[PDB]
Each structure stands twice: as C-alpha cells, then as structure tokens.
C-alpha cells in the first residue's frame, strides 16, 4: 500500500513569552497509514500529560493529528516533538522555535 511520511509543525497556541503559561502543539499531517508515535519533549525527555485530537483526514486521504500539552516557555528549556512512523527509519525530532 501507499506509505506517506508525516509533515510536522511544532508551535505554541499563543505568541510565546518567557515565564508565561501556554500550550505546546505538535501537528502531524499528510501521513498514511494512521499508526503513529508522537511525543512532546522537554530537554530531550518525554512529557507525560500529552493529549491528542481525534483522528481525521484530508482530501487525499492522508491523516492528521494534533498532540498538545500545557508548557511555560523559558530561556533555558528546549522543547521538541519526536515522531515515529513506518515511513521513518529513526524517530524525527523537530525542535520548537518560537519564531515559527
């Protein structure tokens, strides 16, 4: 069958301000099949209270999901999204950059 690799965006719900409570998002889209492993990382370590949207799909049948959790941006902490899918040989890590 067709195997389509995920497109990944990691971003905040609101414009980031250091020390101000917010929500970290990892939007995965354009993938097939639907089984996918998504973790949000704080300093390379897995964040535990992560929630996700209900599986849905686009016109081309590719799936999309949003993974999210509350977070507080800071000058010292590094945030990222780690994705694994049958199309990837190793998990893909996308670092959160507040400018994107």
């Amino acid at each position: 069958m067709i195997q389509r690799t995920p497109k990944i965006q990691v971003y905040s719900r609101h414009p980031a301000e250091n020390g101000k409570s917010n929500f970290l998002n990892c939007y995965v889209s354009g993938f097939h099949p639907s089984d996918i492993e998504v973790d949000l990382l704080k300093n390379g370590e897995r964040i535990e209270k992560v929630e996700h949207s209900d599986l849905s799909f686009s016109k081309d049948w590719s799936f999309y999901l949003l993974y999210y959790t509350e977070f507080t941006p800071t000058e010292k902490d590094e945030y990222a999204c780690r994705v694994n899918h049958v199309t990837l040989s190793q998990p893909k890590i996308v670092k959160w950059d507040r400018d994107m």
Binding site: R13, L55, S56, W61, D99
Partner: protein, 276 residues
C-alpha cells in the same frame, strides 16, 4: 455565509487480535462536534461542542446505534476487500469514508458527497449528480454493480439533500454564537535578521475561523513567490487556526514588501508592512 456538515470514518484492521480500531468524527464547517472511538470507555457517540449537548437521549441513542452500524459495515468491508485484492490475513489495512453536504448563503442544498478509500487510495465515490458512481479499479467496479442493484445512491441522495441539510440548519441555529461567528485573523509581522544585510519578514495570521485563508507577498505591488515560504494552516487547539508566510529580503528594502491577507472575516483584504 456558506456551510457544510461532514462525517469522517476510519477503520484499521488488527489481525493479531480483535476487531478493527474505529474512529468517527463529525464536523460543522471546521468545528468538530461529535466523536466515536471504539477504544473509548463510553461506547457511545460523544459530544464535542456545547451546542450539541442540549440534544435529547433519543438523539444520542440513535447516533450511537448508527455509528456502531458504520463500524460493523467497515469490519465486513475490510474482510471483503482483503478477498478482492487477494491479500493475506496477517497485514493491517484501512478503510476510510467521508460524506456530507454543503449549503449556500441562503442555507439551501448546494452539493453532496460520499467517498470511500481502501489503504489510502480512492476506491468508490458518488458523482456530483448523486446518482452515479466513480469506481477506481475493477474491484470497485464489482462494488459499483452491487450498489446500483441495491439503490445505494438513491438512499444517499435522499439523506444528503434532505436529512443532512435539515440537521445542518438545526445545528447552525443552536450553535449560532460560534458557528455563525467569523473570527478575522489577528495579524502581525516579525523580522528575523539572517545576516548583517538580509532578513526574513514573517507575516502571521492568528486566531482565525474558519480555516480557509490566503496569505500572499507582493514586492512593489507584484506577486512574489521567489524566496518565500508558506506553512500549512494549522489548528491553534482552541478551535481557531494559524498560518504564516515569510520572505527573505535585502536589509533596508523592507518597505517594498507587503503581505496581503484574505479571509471570510475580512470585508476588505488586509495589507501589512514591516514597521521599522
């Protein structure tokens, strides 16, 4: 404005043990309002918007019975399709179905659709006439002949033109406060130096609804696609959407560049420039 009601269903077979994983979601425009997940505890269709919660128990019992019937049709389908394609009982496969109706500004029926996919490829789809079928291959041609004999397109056309549109109007009225509210994009521009003589200008559109939007850059009033980057529209997680477009420019020349924003929530498109 224009509106739509759409339902999305996905089943994924689990050959090692048990029944397929099944997920159903319903949307009015870009707002998810119902869901069913075979792995969830309730085993009921569940509300996901405050305006649907007011529907009575006959509504919820009816939606649960129908969504569980959809899950069983998909379970049977996965078996039939494995046979049509001469596939092993060991692999996991997927079936996806989407159907729904669009209404115009007058809230009258505009179009209906019903599409089916196997392993992420088109399998069979109802044509715009709501009478005919598009079969992608010879296995789908076998299904098309059965669906013609069983009056499937007639049952769908009656639902899409009647029931679908009637309930969509009901939801739009009950959920007026949000469903009929457009949230125009909150826009701003950021500047990111890439050297001592070039910089990226990023035009942001935040907190907008519905998701449909166009962000375009112009240089001296002409469209610019060279050295631009446009991200896919993404959910904010609070029901609204976000998007940005960026262009790399020579430092000192930022005033030649303008970002133009088109959205249903804007009577006139917005124009942004970098404020030095």
């Amino acid at each position: 404005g224009s509106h739509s009601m759409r339902y999305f269903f996905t089943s994924v077979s689990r050959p090692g043990r048990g029944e397929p994983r099944f997920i159903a979601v319903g949307y009015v425009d870009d707002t998810q309002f119902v869901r069913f997940d075979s792995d969830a505890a309730s085993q009921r269709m569940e509300p996901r918007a405050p305006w649907i919660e007011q529907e009575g128990p006959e509504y919820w019992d009816g939606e649960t019975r129908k969504v569980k019937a959809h899950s069983q049709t998909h379970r049977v389908d996965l078996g039939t399709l494995r046979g049509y394609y001469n596939q092993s009982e060991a692999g996991s496969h997927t079936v996806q179905r989407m159907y729904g109706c669009d209404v115009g500004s007058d809230w009258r029926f505009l179009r209906g659709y019903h599409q089916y996919a196997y392993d992420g490829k088109d399998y069979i789809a109802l044509k715009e006439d709501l009478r005919s079928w598009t079969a992608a291959d010879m296995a789908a041609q076998t299904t098309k002949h059965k669906w013609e004999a069983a009056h499937v397109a007639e049952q769908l056309r009656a639902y899409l033109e009647g029931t679908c549109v009637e309930w969509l109007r009901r939801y739009l009225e009950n959920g007026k406060e949000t469903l009929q509210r457009t949230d125009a994009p909150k826009t701003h521009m950021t500047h990111h130096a890439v050297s001592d003589h070039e910089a990226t200008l990023r035009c942001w559109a935040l907190s907008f609804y519905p998701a449909e939007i166009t962000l375009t850059w112009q240089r001296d009033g002409e469209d610019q696609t060279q050295d631009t980057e446009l991200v896919e529209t993404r959910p904010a997680g609070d029901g609204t959407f976000q998007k940005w477009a960026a262009v790399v420019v020579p430092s000192g020349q930022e005033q030649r560049y303008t970002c133009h924003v088109q959205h249903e929530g804007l009577p006139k498109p917005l124009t942004l420039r970098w404020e030095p």
